[PDB]
Symmetry: C3
Subunit: 420 residues, 3 copies
Amino acid sequence: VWKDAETTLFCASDAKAYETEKHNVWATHACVPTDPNPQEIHLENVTEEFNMWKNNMVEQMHTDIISLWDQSLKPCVKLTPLCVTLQCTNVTNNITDDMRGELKNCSFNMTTELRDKKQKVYSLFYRYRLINCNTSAITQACPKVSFEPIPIHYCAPAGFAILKCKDKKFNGTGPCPSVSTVQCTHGIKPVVSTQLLLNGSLAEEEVMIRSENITNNAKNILVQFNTPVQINCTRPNNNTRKSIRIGPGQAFYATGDIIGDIRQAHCNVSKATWNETLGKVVKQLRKHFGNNTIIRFANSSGGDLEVTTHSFNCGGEFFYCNTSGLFNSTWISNTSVNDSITLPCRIKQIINMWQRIGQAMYAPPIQGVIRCVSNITGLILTRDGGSTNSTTETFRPGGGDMRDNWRSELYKYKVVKIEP
Amino acid sequence: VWKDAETTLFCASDAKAYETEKHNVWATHACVPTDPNPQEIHLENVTEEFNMWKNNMVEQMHTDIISLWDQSLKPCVKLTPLCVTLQCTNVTNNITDDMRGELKNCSFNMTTELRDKKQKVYSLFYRYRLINCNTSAITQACPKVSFEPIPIHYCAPAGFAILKCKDKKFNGTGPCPSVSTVQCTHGIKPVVSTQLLLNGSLAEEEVMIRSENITNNAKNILVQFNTPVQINCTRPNNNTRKSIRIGPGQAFYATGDIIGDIRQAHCNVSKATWNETLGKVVKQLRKHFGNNTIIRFANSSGGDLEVTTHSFNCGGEFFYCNTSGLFNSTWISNTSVNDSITLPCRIKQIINMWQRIGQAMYAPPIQGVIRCVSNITGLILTRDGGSTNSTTETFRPGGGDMRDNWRSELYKYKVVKIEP
Amino acid sequence: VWKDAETTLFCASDAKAYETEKHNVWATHACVPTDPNPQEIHLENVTEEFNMWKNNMVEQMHTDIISLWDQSLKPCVKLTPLCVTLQCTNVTNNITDDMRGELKNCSFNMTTELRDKKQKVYSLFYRYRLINCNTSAITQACPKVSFEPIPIHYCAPAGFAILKCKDKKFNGTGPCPSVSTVQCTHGIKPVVSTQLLLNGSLAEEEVMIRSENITNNAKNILVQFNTPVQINCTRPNNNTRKSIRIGPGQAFYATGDIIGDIRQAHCNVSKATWNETLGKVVKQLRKHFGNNTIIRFANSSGGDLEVTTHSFNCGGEFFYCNTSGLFNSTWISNTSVNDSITLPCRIKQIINMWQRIGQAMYAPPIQGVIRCVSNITGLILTRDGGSTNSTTETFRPGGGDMRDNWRSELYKYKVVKIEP
Ligand SMILES: *[C@@H]1O[C@H](CO)[C@@H](O[C@@H]2O[C@H](CO)[C@@H](O[C@@H]3O[C@H](CO[C@H]4O[C@H](CO)[C@@H](O)[C@H](O[C@H]5O[C@H](CO)[C@@H](O)[C@H](O)[C@@H]5O[C@H]5O[C@H](CO)[C@@H](O)[C@H](O)[C@@H]5O)[C@@H]4O)[C@@H](O)[C@H](O[C@H]4O[C@H](CO)[C@@H](O)[C@H](O)[C@@H]4O[C@H]4O[C@H](CO)[C@@H](O)[C@H](O)[C@@H]4O[C@H]4O[C@H](CO)[C@@H](O)[C@H](O)[C@@H]4O)[C@@H]3O)[C@H](O)[C@H]2NC(C)=O)[C@H](O)[C@H]1NC(C)=O
Ligand SMILES: *[C@@H]1O[C@H](CO)[C@@H](O[C@@H]2O[C@H](CO)[C@@H](O[C@@H]3O[C@H](CO[C@H]4O[C@H](CO[C@H]5O[C@H](CO)[C@@H](O)[C@H](O)[C@@H]5O)[C@@H](O)[C@H](O[C@H]5O[C@H](CO)[C@@H](O)[C@H](O)[C@@H]5O)[C@@H]4O)[C@@H](O)[C@H](O[C@H]4O[C@H](CO)[C@@H](O)[C@H](O)[C@@H]4O)[C@@H]3O)[C@H](O)[C@H]2NC(C)=O)[C@H](O)[C@H]1NC(C)=O
Ligand SMILES: *[C@@H]1O[C@H](CO)[C@@H](O[C@@H]2O[C@H](CO)[C@@H](O[C@@H]3O[C@H](CO[C@H]4O[C@H](CO[C@H]5O[C@H](CO)[C@@H](O)[C@H](O)[C@@H]5O)[C@@H](O)[C@H](O[C@H]5O[C@H](CO)[C@@H](O)[C@H](O)[C@@H]5O)[C@@H]4O)[C@@H](O)[C@H](O[C@H]4O[C@H](CO)[C@@H](O)[C@H](O)[C@@H]4O)[C@@H]3O)[C@H](O)[C@H]2NC(C)=O)[C@H](O)[C@H]1NC(C)=O
Ligand SMILES: *[C@@H]1O[C@H](CO)[C@@H](O[C@@H]2O[C@H](CO)[C@@H](O[C@@H]3O[C@H](CO[C@H]4O[C@H](CO[C@H]5O[C@H](CO)[C@@H](O)[C@H](O)[C@@H]5O)[C@@H](O)[C@H](O[C@H]5O[C@H](CO)[C@@H](O)[C@H](O)[C@@H]5O)[C@@H]4O)[C@@H](O)[C@H](O[C@H]4O[C@H](CO)[C@@H](O)[C@H](O)[C@@H]4O)[C@@H]3O)[C@H](O)[C@H]2NC(C)=O)[C@H](O)[C@H]1NC(C)=O
Ligand SMILES: *[C@@H]1O[C@H](CO)[C@@H](O[C@@H]2O[C@H](CO)[C@@H](O[C@@H]3O[C@H](CO[C@H]4O[C@H](CO[C@H]5O[C@H](CO)[C@@H](O)[C@H](O)[C@@H]5O)[C@@H](O)[C@H](O[C@H]5O[C@H](CO)[C@@H](O)[C@H](O)[C@@H]5O)[C@@H]4O)[C@@H](O)[C@H](O[C@H]4O[C@H](CO)[C@@H](O)[C@H](O)[C@@H]4O)[C@@H]3O)[C@H](O)[C@H]2NC(C)=O)[C@H](O)[C@H]1NC(C)=O
Ligand SMILES: *[C@@H]1O[C@H](CO)[C@@H](O[C@@H]2O[C@H](CO)[C@@H](O[C@@H]3O[C@H](CO[C@H]4O[C@H](CO[C@H]5O[C@H](CO)[C@@H](O)[C@H](O)[C@@H]5O)[C@@H](O)[C@H](O[C@H]5O[C@H](CO)[C@@H](O)[C@H](O)[C@@H]5O)[C@@H]4O)[C@@H](O)[C@H](O[C@H]4O[C@H](CO)[C@@H](O)[C@H](O)[C@@H]4O)[C@@H]3O)[C@H](O)[C@H]2NC(C)=O)[C@H](O)[C@H]1NC(C)=O
Ligand SMILES: *[C@@H]1O[C@H](CO)[C@@H](O)[C@H](O)[C@H]1NC(C)=O
Ligand SMILES: *[C@@H]1O[C@H](CO)[C@@H](O)[C@H](O)[C@H]1NC(C)=O
Ligand SMILES: *[C@@H]1O[C@H](CO)[C@@H](O)[C@H](O)[C@H]1NC(C)=O
Ligand SMILES: *[C@@H]1O[C@H](CO)[C@@H](O)[C@H](O)[C@H]1NC(C)=O
Ligand SMILES: *[C@@H]1O[C@H](CO)[C@@H](O)[C@H](O)[C@H]1NC(C)=O
Ligand SMILES: *[C@@H]1O[C@H](CO)[C@@H](O)[C@H](O)[C@H]1NC(C)=O
Ligand SMILES: *[C@@H]1O[C@H](CO)[C@@H](O)[C@H](O)[C@H]1NC(C)=O
Ligand SMILES: *[C@@H]1O[C@H](CO)[C@@H](O)[C@H](O)[C@H]1NC(C)=O
């Protein structure tokens, strides 16, 4: 007897990591070390039926990680008071292109100690007077933290197992020949991004495309790669940490010292991989739903900054990248058709977590010149509903609900229970 | 073996209701649906001894509901800051009877956004300058809530039962012939009122009077009816909801728009029922402790507004009703002796829950013209200690501890445990 | 089978005490009464091996009591706002010795009710204008509390026991002949002090010296006495309680009324006991590690006020005592060698609990003339690393981590588990 769908997930993690960093603090507090036994061991026959996209385990891991995020919001992060009005100026003494600025170094009036005293203080805002924040601001900061995803294992309890499709070619709703039962997963990393999977897991054989409804264009298409497309992101913006402890309740930072004239925040994607991978993707597409069609990739359709750009994190700052460089190639149905692609990005401090309960700020980006090298492990796509007179199919970057990213990770795990 | 008194109560509730309304939110969070099995099934003989007024289950349900009320106090309700001074005026441009006003439309100075800015704002106070609140003010309000009692079932756990006296005529301390054992109650509604039971449960046969000590006038007398006396309460006061979200931490309302000039807030009790019921009550009284006596009913003896009036709620506002109309009849011992009784009521926003930890405000009464039809299911009485030379007995409305209302509801449930 | 080290401790306590006092509130909330059975009963043979200083039970009781202290910090204690600047003066109108003052009666400006009104208010500071507090101030106060250690028993759960060395002469790392197993301890009192144990437990036979590493001078030496050295502490400082409730959120006190000109805060230690005890201690020392050496006792080496003085409490105020009177005797190796010792002490309101999360204030010391008689049950020592050419050994008062005080109390308890 195998019964499914039980919100019960054990956890596993730890080696050299402890506290400080918020991910490390979280894994430390919610996980125990693992054991290198796990045998799974598939048993002969025992079914061919499965459906990864109707897994409530995903929704569990999701709501869990979010609630944990609030549990991190509790102690140090400051929901108040200082955001009122900002006396900002610009570093531009001559100008072209009407740049203005995303980053501004500003002056302020700040409650320090005692009653109603102020001192002149530096403040930076990522996006002149006023302007403030809109109706909420939690400021994370904190003395000892950081933000790098840490491997988290999901295990089944006592009297429970987890079946796992080891079939390389799964239709997602469908015929699976090899079912095994593991007690605990290998350890999943919590990478929060859109459009591409960064870090994550690779396909064992060939590139695999997966959709909950290949006809319904509103449903996402998790495209998993057998190979990584490079992406090196260097944001050489510089900020010097100054945490002025002037008052008991108050804990204020001061960023925006020094110089260096860094261009925005910068990134690259490395293309050879992107050439073969995109060609092979249009190959898979044309060997699935797309039989004879020229495939075109336009950029994001529009929306919130988290939706229009590849919004991901390089350690707690929220990067937004113009994504035209990833999606600007028309793939000819007839046949297939040192330089690297350089993508324009921006660092944000003010992000909107949760629902609107509050905004989250990583206030003192420490040091400067911080490059994050990543492996493009993925694509999340939504199809642009087209016609058949166009003799072409258009595909756009979609996403937003990270639960889709977990289905893209939790695709081979379904918690099940055993009965005599 | 049957051992009693265990603070362990399972709960049951839900059908179409979900969240929003605070009662709905509570039942949703503290209850699971029920099953329409329950068989009770009385067993032949098995005792005649019981005592409803020494039940700690009542004290449990009570403390539970109150703690739950604080659990509702947590998220949205605002204990601070704005109550300081009020710049109020009156709508009276000509006058008789020196009415002044219970309700006032007032002007204020309000922290909106940023640092130390204000804007002119409407404010209403239910009860000229100043005056404020006394040393505490929690303001409930909230975007999605309401307040209507929701059926809550109390069940016994595993290895436990609940004996239930199905005897129609119980002396309260005494001889009960039919004991049954149910797993879960039919579902009790949390009606917070004094003097009368509103909604609640009716007596199966005749009117039943119940007292913990019929000699001790300090002990309450729960008079349960076999029939409901009508009470229709129309408060046609009008208030238009304006919730100005000016600042992140601040959430302010604005009531007191429009007009219609409604007299106070109004109510009615329907009398024919009240005639027969009161006659029958003096009948029961004269067939119990009152053998040969003329029975008179004077109004409340005095005290806090919650004690002098029939303080009940029509959806979160606290109504206070002049109760002379209910208790103004002298019942002659000799024999017995379309018009409806109309009662004067007032709506309050500022109530005192708990102990003095804080006052509770339902700040934006939404809409206007809100009529609540109710069934008078009850009387809670205290006797006026009289003499025997008066050749009369006087009875006054008492109450205050809602636990008495639960004994008036939890009268047929006593949690018990089973042993071999 | 006996396996050790399980963070599981049952608790026991209560007789006549209830709430109010914080210790009473704590024992009331975290303990159930006990039973006067406990039989322990040693069993013949069954080992000689033990090690009291590697007990994680101590660390458990410690972290528990501290977390409980924060749980007391929650409701009434005020982390804010009023500490800004103080307008203080002195009662000295003529002077010798440049005394200044530890205690000052001061004037202030205080938010009372409404918006931005103040009234002239008395304030006392234990340690002229300004000065305030440094970067945190929690103010305890509260309407109904106090602070006197209450006996707390530690018990082993189900399937667990606690072995107990009843050997009078234990080397601490070593050979123990009599092991017994109790379910619950006799009840340990939470005395927070340094250098001396006050209240606490006495040795059954002779004076016993105990060290984790008798060679390592950095390790503490818990010297347990078979007899108490007296210590009577009379602080006849007077303060009159005035709690002005001016505003809803605000709860302010007012101390520093009346007079009496009490000298600081005063104390005594009674010496005859101290004579024999110190002689016997140098006896034990010379019969252990000190074979032929003149033993000298200098005062505290320096540090925070909690480290330099015998920092203990007389009911919630933190006393600091000049400790030269305890350690000023050179003990001749050759042979041994009504007046009472009077020690100078100071009462503090501002103490630093925890880590630096915040300072704790007992704000209104109520009444005046409060004498606490105590039994000196102890010594915590650290050795001054000397030479062998000096032909003398010097010993200094050390301490600070109260866990050492619990090892000094939890010395005969090690929670263990049983297996077939
Ligand atoms: C608590 O207990 C107390 C008693 O202890 C109860 O107190 C009652 O409170 C209610 C609420 O206010 C009172 O109701 C109002 O009564 C007003 C006076 O009514 C008397 O006089 C009228 C003549 O105007 C008379 O018709 C009434 O008797 C009628 O009803 C009885 C049965 O009850 C019946 O036996 C009679 O035959 C009468 O029925 C005739 O008239 C009816 C209309 O009134 C017709 O429907 C029927 O077919 C027949 O022709 C009674 O003697 C009365 O004026 C008020 O009516 C107003 O306002 C109502 C809203 O509150 C609204 O619904 C009505 O339509 C009406 O509005 C119209 O008229 C007014 C002015 O009359 C205009 O301002 C409006 O603009 C509107 O105009 C329209 O109609 C005009 C005339 O036709 C026309 O010109 C115009 O063009 C428009 O078309 C209220 O009904 C009640 O009086 C109180 N009772 C007592 C004993 O004092 C209370 O019930 C109880 N509470 C509860 C919860 O139970
Ligand atoms: C801070 O202040 C500084 C000054 O202190 C200021 O400096 C400017 O910097 C910018 C960027 O380098 C310069 O912009 C470029 O100007 C080029 C030259 O334009 C002049 O000549 C044009 C014709 O030249 C063509 O043909 C001639 C043969 O005659 C040939 O030799 C040339 O090489 C070239 O082929 C002429 O059209 C132009 O005048 C136009 O505009 C003015 C108004 O500004 C108008 O009045 C005229 O009627 C006419 O429309 C001018 O005289 C220019 O070629 C170049 O344009 C190309 O590149 C841009 C992208 O960069 C394309 O958008 C465009 O389509 C062309 O492909 C570009 O515009 C500018 O010249 C400097 N200003 C001066 C005075 O030197 C900065 O703006 C300030 N900011 C900063 C941070 O530096
Ligand atoms: C953005 O802002 C960030 C800050 O938020 C800023 O960070 C800088 O990062 C760079 C690169 O890592 C640092 O540069 C290095 O600085 C080293 C330390 O220099 C300090 O101390 C010097 C002496 O130190 C010796 O002795 C001290 C004890 O006294 C001991 O602690 C040290 O370990 C060491 O033994 C001192 O001379 C120096 O001050 C010099 O310069 C200042 C002006 O800047 C001048 O006022 C002084 O008079 C003096 O000349 C400073 O106080 C330094 O050792 C090191 O130098 C070696 O390496 C470089 C190559 O990297 C060689 O060129 C050089 O010959 C040496 O071998 C190097 O210079 C810098 O310290 C950080 N700044 C801060 C504030 O921490 C980034 O620069 C900014 N980034 C951008 C993009 O703008
Ligand atoms: C806003 O301002 C307006 C004015 O702009 C003002 O209007 C008043 O409205 C009220 C309520 O309707 C009126 O009060 C009533 O007055 C009745 C008439 O009183 C006059 O006459 C009295 C004797 O009349 C009797 O006999 C005569 C024949 O002589 C006969 O026609 C009558 O029908 C009646 O039978 C007389 O006593 C009285 O004068 C008394 O008071 C004045 C001081 O005010 C004093 O100086 C006199 O010496 C004497 O004591 C007056 O001249 C009156 O009958 C009626 O009283 C009965 O009812 C009330 C309950 O309503 C009972 O309490 C009382 O016991 C009686 O049973 C009542 O008092 C008043 O007349 C209006 N004023 C004017 C100027 O017209 C309002 O006050 C303001 N407020 C609002 C919102 O409207
Ligand atoms: C408030 O104001 C009042 C005034 O209104 C003021 O009162 C002072 O109170 C203090 C404490 O009681 C007094 O201090 C003592 O003074 C003693 C006397 O000193 C005088 O005489 C000294 C010599 O006397 C010796 O020899 C004579 C014979 O000649 C013999 O009879 C005496 O008994 C004694 O043996 C003399 O040296 C001294 O003058 C010295 O100092 C002044 C400066 O002040 C300097 O100019 C001189 O050159 C010289 O150095 C003075 O004339 C004194 O004996 C005593 O000292 C002993 O005790 C202290 C400890 O208390 C030791 O530290 C010291 O080593 C000695 O053992 C002590 O100093 C003082 O006299 C009062 N002042 C007056 C004017 O009467 C307070 O200060 C104010 N405060 C309060 C709260 O009261
Ligand atoms: C430090 O400050 C604290 C305050 O925080 C202060 O505390 C005082 O503690 C002392 C000692 O315990 C108290 O002294 C006692 O006060 C008793 C009460 O006196 C009050 O009431 C008197 C009458 O009371 C009778 O009737 C009332 C009802 O009316 C009833 O409640 C009582 O129980 C009792 O039956 C009243 O006369 C008295 O006022 C007198 O004095 C004031 C000036 O102080 C004057 O203005 C009045 O006109 C009047 O003369 C006061 O209001 C009192 O009964 C008691 O007296 C008996 O015992 C003493 C010996 O102890 C005998 O000498 C005396 O003859 C009586 O037998 C005693 O005096 C005092 O009340 C506390 N103060 C406060 C504010 O509570 C300390 O003094 C300060 N300590 C230091 C070191 O400075
Ligand atoms: C998928 O979507 C299409 C419409 O886009 C619909 O026709 C089809 O029935 C859907 N499949 C499922 C399983 O709902
Ligand atoms: C970034 O570095 C990796 C190797 O670490 C390389 O494969 C990749 O091509 C680089 N990215 C670009 C755009 O050059
Ligand atoms: C990047 O994308 C935006 C829309 O998201 C588009 O308008 C813009 O032209 C693109 N930028 C580049 C460099 O192509
Ligand atoms: C607001 O304005 C009123 C006068 O309209 C004044 O009495 C009051 O002091 C003002 N309050 C503030 C916040 O200054
Ligand atoms: C009931 O109250 C009366 C006094 O009012 C008293 O005489 C009687 O003993 C009481 N009964 C009980 C059970 O206490
Ligand atoms: C209503 O009751 C109050 C006392 O609570 C009494 O003073 C008043 O006279 C009564 N009012 C009416 C309308 O009878
Ligand atoms: C309170 O008054 C003092 C002078 O008595 C002054 O120095 C101080 O600034 C005042 N504080 C406030 C709140 O203005
Ligand atoms: C005790 O400390 C001394 C150094 O002071 C060292 O020589 C000895 O090895 C230590 N013993 C243990 C058990 O570490």
